[PDB]
Amino acid sequence: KTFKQRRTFEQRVEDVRLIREQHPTKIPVIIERYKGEKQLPVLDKTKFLVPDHVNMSELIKIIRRRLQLNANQAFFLLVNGHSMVSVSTPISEVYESEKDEDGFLYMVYASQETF
Ligand SMILES: CC(=O)NCc1cncs1
Ligand SMILES: CC(=O)NCc1cncs1
Ligand SMILES: [Cl-]
């Protein structure tokens, strides 16, 4: 069902190594809906190549646009399992501290802060 379940650790590692070789300026991000989540839609895909200069505040703007949300729909984003301390951090810096051992940056969204 989830990305980690669909691909072996070996497979996730090799895919990140390909993104490094073919899209060296991009951050490999997994973005998944919370398994509880009722309100917000599912995305058209799971694996995203994010430009390494965008900060977390702009990535939230991007995901809201991709989900085609309106002004009063609530949106919460967990990174590597927990809340973001800051949305002003460049994703290149967030990646280096919050990346998984497979080399993806894992994110989960919901309409409640209570995930
Ligand atoms: C394409 C690519 O990055 N793979 C090389 C690596 C093998 N050992 C660590 S990374
Ligand atoms: C569009 C692109 O190149 N990657 C950034 C994205 C992150 N989440 C949705 S797309
Ligand atoms: Cl690139």
Curated annotation (Swiss-Prot):
Listed result of changing Q112P: Abolished delipidation by ATG4 family proteins
SUPFAM superfamilies, alphabetized: Ubiquitin-like (SSF54236)
Distribution of this protein across tissues and organs: Most abundant in heart, brain, skeletal muscle and testis. Little expression observed in liver.
InterPro entries: Atg8-like, Ubiquitin-like_domsf
Effect seen on changing H23Y: Increased interaction with WDFY3/ALFY, no effect on SQSTM1-binding
Subcellular location field: Cytoplasmic vesicle, Autophagosome membrane; Endomembrane system; Mitochondrion membrane; Cytoplasm, Cytoskeleton
Database matches in Pfam families: ATG8 (PF02991)
Alphabetic keyword roster: Autophagy, Cytoplasm, Cytoplasmic vesicle, Cytoskeleton, Lipoprotein, Membrane, Microtubule, Mitochondrion, Phosphoprotein, Ubl conjugation, Ubl conjugation pathway
Modification after translation (UniProt): The precursor molecule is cleaved by ATG4 (ATG4A, ATG4B, ATG4C or ATG4D) to expose the glycine at the C-terminus and form the cytosolic form, LC3-I. The processed form is then activated by APG7L/ATG7, transferred to ATG3 and conjugated to phosphatidylethanolamine (PE) phospholipid to form the membrane-bound form, LC3-II. During non-canonical autophagy, the processed form is conjugated to phosphatidylserine (PS) phospholipid. ATG4 proteins also mediate the delipidation of PE-conjugated forms.
Known outcome of mutating H23A: Decreased interaction with Legionella effector RavZ
Impact when changing Q22K: Increased interaction with WDFY3/ALFY, no effect on SQSTM1-binding
Biological role stated in the UniProt entry: Ubiquitin-like modifier involved in formation of autophagosomal vacuoles (autophagosomes). Plays a role in mitophagy which contributes to regulate mitochondrial quantity and quality by eliminating the mitochondria to a basal level to fulfill cellular energy requirements and preventing excess ROS production.
Record-given protein name: Microtubule-associated protein 1 light chain 3 beta
Lineage: Eukaryota, Metazoa, Chordata, Craniata, Vertebrata
The encoding gene: MAP1LC3B
